[PDB]
């Protein structure tokens, strides 16, 4: 049904609070962060190039927790 | 020897162009990005908190390249 009859853009359409990132996929040549929305149509693709400006603090933080780390060499 | 006798801060001391981020280390319970400098003392430890504000673009982009997604849950 989507909130409000008036057509609304994609990610960060109005300015709703970011719930939590739960997706990431590289399209033609740019990440497509799957932004989650509490009220809005949860989950939506957004070009990394566009997302970075929307909220770098959010994206940067997402990677921090999702850090696996390779392997420390010290033979 | 360091450029200029006058003491200079750490990362983003004056405002020299950022060559390229080498990586990141969780020092003191906080991720730190080693900013590489072309003219300045190449490589310097900087807290994620300070780095994000200095240049989120380079920061976000760094992970974008060194990114890897896990196996798709759905069988």
């Amino acid at each position: 049904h989507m909130k409000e009859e008036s057509e609304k853009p994609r990610g960060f359409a109005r300015g709703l609070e970011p719930e939590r990132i739960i997706g990431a996929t590289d399209s033609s040549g740019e990440l497509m962060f799957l932004m989650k929305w509490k009220n809005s149509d949860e989950a939506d693709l957004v070009p990394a190039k566009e997302a970075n400006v929307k909220c770098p603090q959010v994206v940067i933080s997402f990677y921090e927790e999702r850090l696996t780390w390779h392997s420390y060499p010290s033979d | 020897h360091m450029k200029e006798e006058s003491e200079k801060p750490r990362g983003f001391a004056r405002g020299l162009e950022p060559e390229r981020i080498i990586g990141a280390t969780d020092s003191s319970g906080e991720l730190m990005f080693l900013m590489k400098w072309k003219n300045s003392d190449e490589a310097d430890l900087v807290p994620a908190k300070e780095a994000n504000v200095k240049c989120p673009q380079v920061v976000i982009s760094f992970y974008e390249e060194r990114l890897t997604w896990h196996s798709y849950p759905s069988d």
Binding site: G23, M32, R66, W69, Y72 | G23, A24, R66, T68
Partner: peptide
């Protein structure tokens, strides 16, 4: 299949790989 082309892709768990900062330092003349 206009702008909203994306419908199905990956839904796993993103992870970043990093080798610290000065973890590796290959050298032969040493």
């Amino acid at each position: 299949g206009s702008k909203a082309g994306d419908l199905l892709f990956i839904e796993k768990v993103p992870v970043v790989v990093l080798e610290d900062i000065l973890a590796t330092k290959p050298s032969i003349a040493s």
